[model samples]
Target chain A: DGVDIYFGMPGEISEHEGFLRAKMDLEERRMRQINEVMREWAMADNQSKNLPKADRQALNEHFQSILQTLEEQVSGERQRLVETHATRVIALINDQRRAALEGFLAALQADPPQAERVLLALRRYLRAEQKEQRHTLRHYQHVAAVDPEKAQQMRFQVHTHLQVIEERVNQSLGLLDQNPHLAQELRPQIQELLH
Target chain B: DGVDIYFGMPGEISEHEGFLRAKMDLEERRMRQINEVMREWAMADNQSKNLPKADRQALNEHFQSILQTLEEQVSGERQRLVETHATRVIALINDQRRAALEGFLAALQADPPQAERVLLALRRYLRAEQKEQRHTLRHYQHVAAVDPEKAQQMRFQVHTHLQVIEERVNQSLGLLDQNPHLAQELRPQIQELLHS
Candidate 1:
């Protein structure tokens, strides 16, 4: 009874942000130390103490290669994870849509006289659905620009809900059209659904 | 020649943050819509049109349960991913420490007259290593507080570097102690390694 279901979780700074900040800090300090050491090594003119030129180049190249490899690995791994997470999120949204529609259908079955009320609910549901899809598409615009194939895949998935909503609406309209008596009473509701 | 090797990548908002922000925004809007729908439903007084009390309660519970499940799934998945990422990161830090020591040893072999120089490098490397480990331990402090077994496991892994560093230092000291000539020339350097 006391729980605020809608906005229960605060959306401010997250633990993931904390982790990233700490990680970046660690990298910064490490990189700074490594660069300072390298700078001192390069500036030293004591031929008796320094490694030969080729050896020095080889060492530098080795570290450079490691950093390059590390960067690519980190970037690639994050990409894979983000894609996976996005897929799961999209799937859940689909489930939510399905659940919403199920409740709508249940209401229709529970009370046909409540046509206006249920239709209003459907309109609101559709509005939310369309907005959600648009947000999803915009959120992944970066992916869309770089990856047309994946974008198309996401687009198709997003639009499938649109397809379902249209099918159900058309199905209802076809039924209502067959019954002029009910249609007369629900004319405004049907028009709302059509819009 | 054109590239700045260090600090090349800026540490500001990341792609992950962008994704998270977008997600939270979407959820906020969705939740707001849901709550509004629910409020309207609760306030409707048309006896001929409204659902029965039991049916309304069932509908509310259905949506509530779905939200609860969804929240758990998202939270758990994020926890798993953060842990996995931390593991990979700590492993890389270990690799970095290993590479630094390898370079130090290579320098030692390249020139014994550079005793002071190599020792200085080792000391610096060790300093970075210890600091890195402390940061790592702090990073996982949250995990440690919640899950002791996993924390101990991470602690062991982190301390393994410390173990290796000490082992190498003691090994070098043992060898140096046998050579009085070399030891005499490198007394100050040996003292530094001891401290490291």
Candidate 2:
């Protein structure tokens, strides 16, 4: 139970809007795949992992932040080139996620108590992950020379996709906002995975 | 495209400086393992590894910092029980390093552009890795006090063992500050890893 956003386009993306759509999709993908990232990180050697309330809360906050940021920024015509930055950062975080997965995966599979410690570590990583949000934020720099109308449209279109708790990778054809209420609503549900 | 530092232990660790010795030896291993970590991170699926000078400089800076930290901290007394913290953190770093090796080993076996990209990414992870240092640093807080003399000896002894770069699991017993010329320095090496 996590996010809903896509990074790359699946069926159709026009050339002009392609870049914007692609950027939007990547955020979605990151949101959409964050749980996948979580699962991958949390996978360790075991499937069973539980976290402390503080640890759980940290992750809980990030779950909200993703929603918060997505809510915060909807669209922009001049999408700074986030591909390399995006890929590198995503890869960087995943490197840790995947490593955490590897580190305890086998042992976690073998032992039970170890899972909690690993989960705690992974959740703290949830905080480490805000680096992405930071990068995502600075991605655009507003200046005297700008595209307000197009960027305005870009901003409008970007925020279209809906939010959710249950995981879904492949988003729909349209970008539509889901109830923001749900992201806050489902904190416990997503946090429950640790249990 | 990256580095050369120790990651594994070398030879026998002495008894007197056991704590310090162990900590130092691990640093040596990290020094030796530096290249290994770089190689692993650089070893992406498509292995053409050429990091920007700045990026290379970043890793290079870490190398120097590792050596620098080593230089600065070697002579000590109270060796905070960083062994567990070190092992856990180093193990965590190595965990990633080892897996990166596993990922490209077969795929990269047949001439790899695959591996370098992997390293480039890892270099960033180097920045990402600082996550451990904070954990490493804040490991102990003061409510009660501890010893200093013997702990200093522990600190001193652990800093010994000078060695080379062949990817060994053991180290020398000599703790003389290598030329500082190269062995490298810093918590930043790790903090750089955290980037984060």
Candidate 3:
């Protein structure tokens, strides 16, 4: 039901693959810089006493500067990672919501009576998914805030929602087991929901 | 002038050793917990389809819990380390001050004129040491505050002080060349200042 066009089109998928590769490259560069700075500091500290006074002072200053730079870079990278992941998860939720809505609309147009039942089931599924996503998003936000108590509580909520989602997916599959043809029809829709 | 008690006194020196060991142990334990949590989360996310419902839930919960506990523990340890080190340095400064004062007082009682220059040098050394200790204490306090900019500034100050103290000790030792007998007598004191 949702667009699998990108998956089928190699050219279109390559753009996403390229972006992922670039992100990984940038992250790797930052980590390398961090490790280099750490090594510089270790060398400076170890050789501080043996070095001449003027050279030792210069080395100390250089090492300290490296540490400060590393600290700033790490802090900034941490914030960037949090924002990137949050955005990705939010986009996924939006995609799921839109796909569910499209399915409901198509079902209504195809057959009114059967469509009404399908729409109701789709609404129930969407609501549960939305609730689960909201819970997860809130937990993530709490962690980003570094609020321990709220994070702990939200962690429990996340665990509960994960279980609920698993159960709902299983129960829905069981319904498909009774009407096997329905499994084929609902596969794509259910797959989007599962993701 | 300082006490020369046996360095092998188990209870006396071992207490400081134990404190250091405890600090290291706690730091290691916290790091281990953090690593374990990261590994579990990685496994869950990597094997998302294969992860059983219950296992996935448990992993996420464990990860969040560990993050919270580790963050708090690390912060607490950072603060405690600063406090402990500051207190130790301050106590050492006070002990030096007391020893220097006692020497000055005894010199005054024995032969005031002959001891005048020696006492002046001792007082100068004591004052410089106290000033450095105070600087260290303030730096540690700023670190405990955990304000990023302030912490950064304190780190710079520490590096600067380390250089300054090293220079002062070297200069003081160079002065010993001028008065070999007195410098030889004060060699231990000079070494203590340098090490401190």
Candidate 4:
């Protein structure tokens, strides 16, 4: 019932989309087979002892082959998706941060302390963005490096960037904490990044 | 090459186990399908759109039904697993906490001033735990009551127990903090729980 409420409109549209329809058919076919396979596996312990050695050997080989292939494909696909999405999301966030910081800087020119506070907030925001970007890059490099040794070294470089971002965030937080008024004003901004 | 490793003598013995073999097979099959589906979904936006309306309708219905069924099964299986495991895990943690508290109490008795410190540390631990429990129970209750009206009243009972726990912890932390030497001894325990 809740699902219907949440996806009712989208669900109707999906039904009309040819690609979505084909995807659903494929998923349905796979689901049925998977469930049946699970049921068979669940009872294998009780039935295996009575089965012929040849039969058992065949089944094991078949299972292992399928599992290994699935593992590789799933892991590769997941890594690709994460890296692509992370790059796009990070780019968007960086663009917004640059624009916001520029606007804040222009507004604070007449008031030095207020300007400093805005800079402090902007630094915190940028630091967080850098940390997230580093994390994503490290993850991408680590996944890509699995088969190649050179890529692994690049992963370390990403890790170093993460450390740099953390240090900057800590410095900014420390400065803001010392100035209560500045801290109060920036609290919402910090909270915005956190959420 | 990896497949060859599994075919070796020692590996063969383990692989031939019936239940294990079936589990391996099903897991492999599902993983492949899931990966394929994800890939297709990712590329769907770029794909050309051309299909008869009837074919599209049939495909959509098939996919939606399959998704719904899979979701239901997953939810049920997850809930059952959690129910089976939660009691044992919670009991083990509670036993460990009780043992630690008792040991601390005995040591404090030997050193009188240590008692005050232990009390303060104990109070903080108890209060924090109580507050956390209340926070969790309330959050769950708030969500549950929206659909399960009966859960609303039951949540109130949970909140009552949380209040009791908080009061007891507060009393202990206060008593321990009052005695400087006792507070000093309890400091380590408090720091251990709060910081660690």
Candidate 5:
């Protein structure tokens, strides 16, 4: 997801990647076996015979307490990360995209009444940005299988970006409404972009 | 593992379990394909051409910042949970075991002087405790392959528990050293548990 796109391959193949793949495969198989065993154990109500009932009750209480704490910690961290990505990462990126469009409009001297050419050019630029977002979404689709949650978040972020782009176009339309002459000149171009 | 084992069948087929298994299988296959595609992408130095260099640089900086924050967050939470489990869960469990032993000793009226029967029973109890630790480690072994990091921690904890058991025995021996009569009576039993 980083835009730097550094693809310099280290000289040799990585043994670590190979090891991780093998470990994942082994773990998957083992997990299945463990689940099967647990199913069998649950069927028979199997439990340790050593501890007294009070001791067992105490241990269960402690286990539940720790499990509850772990649940809260994991969920809180996930929520924090999700919010940071939405606001700090995706929203900020859209802000930069808007700023770039503004910079282009300013360079061509398109403010208020004298903005006919700026409106047409801005419409085309915004179209390109929408296409760019779609392309980025295709990249995220490749990761969807491995990480559906992150991919779903990326999907929503792209939707928000598209809406923001349309909002930018509407904001331009409001400005163009004041300048009837320019609006008449670039009415179809603006309408085409908006539709 | 929780000591309370609750097993009750709801008398119905669960479609959710079957669905989850199918989803996991599909995801696993898709993940492998994605990895192959990523390996190819890395080979070709592929990147999008729309954005300018400065925009790319800015995006990369933001990504690195967020990733750094995520790394710290994950590690901090994991460490916190690990410490809590070690102290609150495992250590507290051991404290209960020690207290149970103390209760049994006190019931037999063996505080300091009249303690020969208590010493013999306590030696056998410590031996059983060591065996119980070994059983818990065996249970953890079932989870070893699925979560090796967690299972390794469990193994280390069992080692610590065994050491604590020996430490408890040593403390009893120290107490017995003060009472020479009971020490002489239970010398062979204590030595057997310690070594033979």
Candidate 6:
């Protein structure tokens, strides 16, 4: 079958809509990866007792590293999107200003003084537009950075998962619990974190 | 025979000696108490698994409260020590000043004009002592306020305790995994932090 020509006039190309959907896709992918990683971590915790001390510690840190790296990438993605949107907005602003300049040029009645005034006005307009655009973009970035709903659910889940594992980590048999001194020359150098 | 005479001459009351010993006793007590509290918290972390949701949370918060309250008391005690030492130091400074005035009075070759100068010097000494005392005490108080040593150890212990727990938390009937809309609506929080 041949490609069907639209022939129809398309509406506005919502750069925002497409960009937002792509971002959503990336977010979805990252979420799955994060969950898979977390699930692996949880399973490791379940089996930590069986593994030797050294092995348990290594695998634990290995998994933790994965989550942290992915988190860094995900967190930075929102910033990249903001920059992308801001760049588009800046181009749009200049486009409007340039069109105005061309209109002024096409009109021979335009004088040097009027042109200077228009340039100054455009500069002011750019500054105002940048501030406005930044405010709007930054607002979404923070929201996307750490959504309240997402954060609460994560907190609850983490807290629950920790209920059993915390007990195990602190047991006398835990990696560093046996060492008499933790801060001095005998420091076991346990690398762990809590919520 | 109301007051027995001592074989040795007791020139001064040795107030400084008594106070210093008392401070040592307090230090020893605090060290033991701090260590004991930390050990108990360590044990609590050990049993975190067996307890139910409510119990585990209660225990977790209870241990945290113990440390926080102890930190506060330790902080306050340090402030009190600073104040106590400062008050004594102030007393000693004024005492020396009083002796200086007495000597000036006894040797009334004390020209009135020079005596006025001596009084002014004492005033300056008092001002300097206060400023110096406050400055020194404040430094110690600040150090004791947070007690960096305690804070560091607690941080290290807590970090280690939570390492494995964090992974387990996101795995089991976890919040995000359990919820259907958590991914699209909640998304991944991914706050695993550095270290295991």
Q: Indicate which candidate wins on DockQ.
A: 3
As a whole number from 0 to 100, the lDDT of residue B48 in candidate 6 is 82
Question: Taking the tens digit of each residue's C-alpha lDDT, what string does model 2 give over B6-112?
Answer: 43333474333555676556444433433333333333312324766667666556544443343233222113444444565556655664554444333323353
TM-score of chain B of each: 0.57, 0.24, 0.49, 0.41, 0.46, 0.47
The TM-score ranking, best first, is 1, 3, 5, 4, 6, 2
Residues A1-195, candidate 4: write the lDDT tens digits. Answer: 998768544544532363445444544443344333333543553477789999888765664444334334433544554465557566766675566555544434435447345765566566545546544443433333232334333433443454555565556456556567756866786666543
List interface RMSDs for the candidates, in order.
14.7, 25.4, 11.6, 22.0, 15.0, 22.4
Poorest 10 consecutive residues of model 2 chain B by lDDT? B161-170
Looking at the true structure's interface, with contacts defined as alpha carbon pairs within 8 Å between chains A and B, what fraction does model 3 recover? 0.05
Predicted structure 4, TM vs. truth: 0.28
Is model 3 an incorrect, acceptable, medium or high docking prediction? incorrect
Question: Residue-wise lDDT of candidate 6 within B59-113, one digit each (tens)?
Answer: 8778656645554565566567657776876577557645654443333333432
Model 2 lDDT tens row, A1-195: 133334444447543465566555644443333333233333331322465656655654554444333322332211344444456555776576455444433332333334445445445443334333333222211110122223222221211211110111113100112323333443454366433
State which candidate has the highest TM-score: 1
lDDT of 4 at A11: 40
**All DockQ scores:** 0.02, 0.01, 0.04, 0.01, 0.02, 0.01
lDDT of 1 by residue, A61-178 (tens): 6544543443444445445545655675667566766676665555455544466665665665565565554555344343333344454344334334434554555564454455
Q: By summed lDDT, which 10 consecutive residues of candidate 6 chain B come out lowest?
A: B187-196
Better of 3 and 4 by DockQ: 3
**Model 6 lDDT at residue B108:** 31
User: Whole-model lDDT for model 5 versus the true structure?
Assistant: 0.51
User: Over the stretch B14-37, how does candidate 4's per-residue lDDT look in tens digits?
Assistant: 322633554445444433443333
Off by over 4 Å in 1: A1-195, B1-49, B135-165, B168-196
Q: Write the per-residue lDDT of candidate 5 for residues B89-193, one digit (tens) a residue.
A: 455456656775775466355455445566556665665565555445444533452344465345435445445665666775575576577678777877776
- Give candidate 3 misplaced runs (Cα > 4 Å): A1-28, A42-48, A51-58, A115-128, A131-146, A149-195, B1-196
